[PDB]
């Protein structure tokens, strides 16, 4: 990214966070 | 509980006469009986990366979203309201989610069919509210505020990133509701969900040439945050404006039978 806008960057393919227990265990 | 998961999870080896207990399925909890718990396992250090299943890796592919040939002597240009509803291979892949937040990355690819001319093209992006052109030589093409991009044909394809311009914090892919506040408003159309208009013309004046200009637009959604996943649409689409359904006459993907049938359940 040599542009001045942060949306112009390449696709940030780094979000390895999960939370499957809001779908498989949506319980209390 | 949220946790960073880079690879698929490992397996722990298991352990005459174990005594488990009952299961909770009617409560809407998917059964967390691990294979460690139920059956005989070994220790498998699972190094299979999950990175290609990420939502950023699932949807950031520059899919063809618009393809028109316009003759050159909408005549002499084309405009296209930027939607994901156009080609149903991408549409089903984005109708998996309810709320999307993506920056489009439009790549206009211009080809010419019938001494080929080296024309110059203008891909002006008209957002909603700004006026759209009606001729090849209207005064809206020379607008200062619209984000025109001037590209030739014998070059790399013109690529611009359109940001996330919804006035809400995500695109309602599915809008259970009505536009505006008059009761004749269309169902399933969010006024916030509109991207804009991608108007492409040939900057050159009228040339006596018999060449047809085929323009392909490639949208690659990127920086994707996606919310509330949905059942994948099984029936064939009926229109780009709504989620109507008819189904095939027979299975598969029919109304009475989505799965292709067999003889009996004991087959």
């Amino acid at each position: 990214n040599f542009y001045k806008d942060s949306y112009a960057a390449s696709a940030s393919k780094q979000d390895f966070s999960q939370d499957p227990s809001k779908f498989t265990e949506p319980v209390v | 509980i949220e946790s960073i998961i880079k690879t698929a999870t490992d397996t722990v080896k298991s352990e005459l006469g174990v005594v488990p207990s009952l299961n909770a399925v009617e409560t809407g909890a998917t059964s967390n009986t691990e294979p460690e718990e139920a059956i005989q396992t070994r220790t498998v250090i699972n190094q299979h990366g999950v990175s290609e299943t990420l939502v950023e890796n699932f949807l950031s592919r520059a899919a063809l979203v618009s393809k028109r040939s316009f003759e050159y002597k909408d005549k002499n240009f084309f405009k296209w309201t930027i939607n994901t509803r156009s080609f149903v291979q991408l549409r089903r892949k984005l109708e998996l989610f309810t709320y999307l937040r993506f920056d489009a990355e439009i790549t206009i690819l211009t080809t010419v069919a019938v001494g080929l001319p080296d024309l110059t093209l203008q891909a002006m992006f008209v957002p909603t509210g700004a006026l759209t052109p009606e001729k090849q030589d209207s005064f809206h093409w020379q607008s200062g505020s619209n984000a025109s991009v001037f590209f030739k044909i014998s070059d790399p394809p013109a690529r611009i990133t359109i940001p996330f311009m919804c006035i809400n914090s995500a695109y309602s892919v599915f809008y259970d509701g009505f536009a505006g506040f008059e009761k004749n408003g269309l169902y399933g159309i969010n006024p916030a969900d509109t991207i804009g208009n991608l108007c492409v013309r040939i900057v050159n004046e009228h040339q006596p040439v018999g060449f047809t200009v085929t323009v392909r637009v490639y949208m690659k959604p990127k920086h994707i945050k996606a919310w509330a996943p949905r059942p994948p649409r099984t029936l064939p689409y009926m229109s780009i404006a709504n989620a109507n359904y008819k189904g095939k006459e027979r299975a598969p993907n029919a109304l009475s039978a989505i799965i292709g049938n067999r003889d009996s359940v004991k087959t």
């Binding site: 319980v27 | 009761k183 059942p231 989620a243 109507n244």
Partner: protein, 233 residues
């Protein structure tokens, strides 16, 4: 083991369901300060609209396809929620749905009590969008035309991706879904938009030895953590 849920002045005697369904793992709350748009002070009926509006009990016979109530189209014409909807311009509310299907031990069946966010319905075998009278039914709700495809061409077989519980008439007779605010916008228009859709679909139909069988399904929706803006009249 039996239990009483008292929100506001309305109370419901309930069975202790283990693991009440917090929809998408979240509990509804008021609009936080860093996510708010409308600057005026939101009216917040802390017990006046946060109470169980028990809808009309629908008769579940053998040939019933399903039922859907679009929230808050179910509640726009009812009570202090219906007064605040038609006298404000915005709202922000979660819901606590308590679907209870009271049957004997000789009845069988299974319900998918599913709460579909943004249920853009479809009409069968036409390219006309569904009108205002096909979507905004009101308190009476709507019967599923084709529940197998959720009336939008998707699949019921995958409808458990949504917040859902099961009423298997062996195990339980009640289901409870606790819906958060589910919208792109921090507040929206209750007369126009319907965020959730409580869909009760009998997957396994009802059954007993007599062919004329019927089990009523009681729906009770408590709009939790209501805000509103744009007070007029």
């Amino acid at each position: 083991r039996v239990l009483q849920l008292k929100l506001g002045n309305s109370a419901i005697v309930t069975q202790e369901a283990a693991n009440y369904c917090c929809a998408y793992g979240e509990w509804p709350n008021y609009l936080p300060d860093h996510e708010a748009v409308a600057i005026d002070k939101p009216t917040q009926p802390e017990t006046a609209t946060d109470r169980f509006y028990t809808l009309k009990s629908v008769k579940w016979e053998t040939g019933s396809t399903g039922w859907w109530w679009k929230l808050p189209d179910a509640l726009n014409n009812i009570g202090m929620f219906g007064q605040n909807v038609q006298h404000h311009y915005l709202y922000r509310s979660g819901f606590l749905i308590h679907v209870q299907c009271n049957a004997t031990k000789f009845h069988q069946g299974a319900l998918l009590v599913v709460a579909i966010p943004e249920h853009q319905r479809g009409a069968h075998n036409t390219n006309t969008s569904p009108g205002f009278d096909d979507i905004m039914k009101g308190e009476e709700g709507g019967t599923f035309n084709h529940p197998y495809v959720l009336d939008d061409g998707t699949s019921l077989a995958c409808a458990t991706i949504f917040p859902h519980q099961w009423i298997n008439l062996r195990t339980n007779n009640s289901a409870t879904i606790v819906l958060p605010w589910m919208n792109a916008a921090p507040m929206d228009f209750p007369l126009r938009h319907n965020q959730w859709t409580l869909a009760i679909i009998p997957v396994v139909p009802l059954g007993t030895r007599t062919t004329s069988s019927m089990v009523p399904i009681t729906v009770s929706i408590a709009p939790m953590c209501c805000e509103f803006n744009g007070l007029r009249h």
